[PDB]
Amino acid sequence: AKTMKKIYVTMKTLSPLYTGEVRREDKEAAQKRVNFPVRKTATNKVLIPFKGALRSALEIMLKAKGENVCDTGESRARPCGRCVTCSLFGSMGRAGRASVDFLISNDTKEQIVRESTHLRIERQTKSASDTFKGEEVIEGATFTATITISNPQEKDLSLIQSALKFIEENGIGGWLNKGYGRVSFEVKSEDVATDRFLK
Amino acid sequence: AKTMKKIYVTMKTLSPLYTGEVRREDKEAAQKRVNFPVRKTATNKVLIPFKGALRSALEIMLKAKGENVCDTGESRARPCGRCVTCSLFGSMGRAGRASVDFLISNDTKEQIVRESTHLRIERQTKSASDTFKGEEVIEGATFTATITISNPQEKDLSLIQSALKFIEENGIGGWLNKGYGRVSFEVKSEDVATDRFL
Amino acid sequence: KTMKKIYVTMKTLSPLYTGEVRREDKEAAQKRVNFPVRKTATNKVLIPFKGALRSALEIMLKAKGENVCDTGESRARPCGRCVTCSLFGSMGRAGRASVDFLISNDTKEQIVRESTHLRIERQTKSASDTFKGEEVIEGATFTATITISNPQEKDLSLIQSALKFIEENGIGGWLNKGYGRVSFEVKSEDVATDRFLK
């Protein structure tokens, strides 16, 4: 109501980072050169989705704790509107209090995105069957995001921080199984006034 | 009465921008090739509804200050016709002083509108349960809107800029929780004698 | 629920060469070295661990004789119904075991050296070709973890069997020349998925 939580999230990259290009035209433009383009902006910056990773993290950990959280990851599954993640990230009735931005990079592709080569070793002759080139984000690349909770309760800090620690465990996006996407987060949280901008 | 405030707003997208397609025939024509088309003109330019964004921004921030501003957010609500948003954006008995133009882009669809691939991932299996396509307006795309205020007071400028910083913080359009619609505003204000066409 | 931490430590016992995959890192090192080592932008040496583990498990389990597909032939589609498909992934479910990369604990200066190799003419017994590469020295320590999301009973012993195959046969490139012989130390722990939830 009168107050609102601002969570400035600074993410550093440790392993290589991949998030696939979602725009059709940008992707098909890049498939003349690279087979797995990094999700990039038109201002030449790296765009990573961040709301769904936080929601998936909090869903898995709250489900393992034993809380009454619906699973919105199942195919066309309706959120019930009474879970904690429904109050934070959203339900069908009401939107989420937390409005997570994309992880906008602090640099610009040509300093952080490199074109890499991955293969498929044939297991008995030890030769390369397939060879594919994919773009990735270097390690130490800095990404910025802000999580703006409109109506803060007390848990909305610690739940977001716990989900961020889960994203340090499993990775933020792309090929999480091959070791990509391992990142760290720093959190600067403040509770601003909603009427701050009114002079 | 003798003056109008003119607010030339140029807004540039710092994020992907989604607002929804409104026209039924345009939507159903583009519910086949894409599943969330963005709002277009028939001159193929992107429309964003701007008045409701400013009105919502001012109503949340003015209820935060404790001023006796009403709320036209709940279902079938009533403009009280006595607040400063009621004076600016209108009531049922009196019109709005601030006529707020649509956010008209300067580019067309092939320059700023890109189709996409949005997903829904199963939490346990880590596989894409759902796929759906949705158009978005690119980052760095810039839009114009002219807000014209008849009978200006002293504080219309400050409230409109404050609403624009709130729109920068929250976003404009749809999918605001996923990071869409975060923008930046530039404002060129000018005082006008209303008879400049004569 | 539970998830299994497998903290994996590699000590290099014979010079380790894995190849640089980044094009900008490789064609700017071509004036110096004809075979760069895979490095980070933090200048620590990266080794791909997953494919070595999965190749190991296909070779050993196919020799023992169970239904395990091959993911190594030309465009070899995984089946989804085997132990390797459950652990490391398929075209349906993802891999239950997330295998992090092998990043060295020391930066490039301590562990990467720039060596000279040759091709000797078999008749004249003279140097016929000469090329420079980069190798990770012996005793360099690389740290990974392996996380198993849905842990079954056999999974630690299966991963450690693949880690014994990689100790004997090797990891990286130039494997038949003696390059890449390693030793693994593994500390395992089972952790609950609600651990960061205070």
Partner: protein, 281 residues
């Protein structure tokens, strides 16, 4: 920016030794010329020439006229030689013959919506540099851009896709579907309407594809019910409830059978069926 007609000058919108300050305007004698100063320019409208005139103090632009030696004498003796001279008010061949001599003193001449090239080759044929090109002139509402047949190819293919996916073979035009009584249709569509497999969007889409003929409705219900070979996923909304996996399939089969059995009912009859569920149409 000068617009030729006399001589208009758009900065103040004036159109052509004491100093009158409107845009610093000052009239020097021709033996008369006017020197105008603005932040974007130091223009000089000379008028005609007669022999020792009064050239201004930097004349960024010098708009002169002649119909020959005196023009060039005046082109020199002016401190800080102009960026571009303009050759007006004369015959074209004599203007070109003078202009060759202003090029020989290394000073540029010009003889009297924004348009954007989205082109990409060059040729050095004749005195001027060029690139032969056949293309398209689009006239957008604030730009005029130039394109080639690749862009026309892309919008032609978009028009072909948008016009092919717009008219089906036998829709709104004039057998072997299942059959089931009206009471079981009531019970099934009530049951499949409380849980969300048959929802108001799906009843409405059944209504449009039934109004477009029976075969359009059969095609729609088949492609809704068609299980994918790969994902094993049908285009129904999932039922809200415990239903574990097999009565999920029997329930989608119930939706398939109930809609397909409702197809051969009369159009007014399926209307009296559906409006209890979706009041709109």
């Amino acid at each position: 920016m000068i617009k030729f007609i006399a001589f208009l000058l758009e900065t103040a919108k004036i159109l052509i030794r004491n100093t009158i300050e409107l845009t610093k305007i000052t009239f020097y004698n021709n033996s008369v010329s006017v020197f105008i100063e603005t932040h974007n320019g130091n223009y000089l409208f000379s008028g005609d020439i007669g022999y020792p005139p009064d050239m201004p103090d930097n004349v960024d632009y010098l708009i002169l006229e002649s119909t020959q030696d005196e023009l060039i004498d005046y082109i020199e003796r002016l401190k800080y030689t102009p960026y571009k001279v303009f050759l007006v008010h004369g015959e074209k061949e004599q203007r070109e013959i003078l202009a060759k001599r202003i090029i020989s003193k290394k000073i540029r001449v010009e003889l009297p919506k924004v348009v954007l090239n989205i082109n990409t080759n060059m040729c050095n044929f004749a005195s001027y540099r060029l690139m032969p090109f056949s293309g398209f002139i689009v006239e957008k509402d604030d730009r005029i851009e130039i394109n080639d047949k690749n862009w026309f190819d892309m919008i032609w293919n978009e028009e072909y896709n948008k016009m092919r996916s717009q008219i089906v073979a036998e829709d709104f035009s004039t057998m072997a579907l299942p059959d089931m009584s009206h009471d079981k249709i009531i019970e099934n569509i009530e049951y499949l309407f409380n849980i969300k497999i048959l929802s108001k969007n799906r009843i409405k889409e059944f209504w449009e594809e039934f109004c477009k003929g029976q075969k359009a409705a059969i095609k729609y219900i088949t492609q809704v019910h068609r299980k994918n070979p790969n994902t094993g996923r049908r285009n129904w909304n999932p039922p809200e409830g415990d239903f574990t996996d097999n009565e999920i399939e029997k329930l989608y089969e119930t939706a398939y059978n109930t809609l397909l059995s409702l197809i051969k009912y009369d159009k007014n009859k399926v209307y009296n069926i559906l409006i209890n569920f979706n009041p709109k149409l």
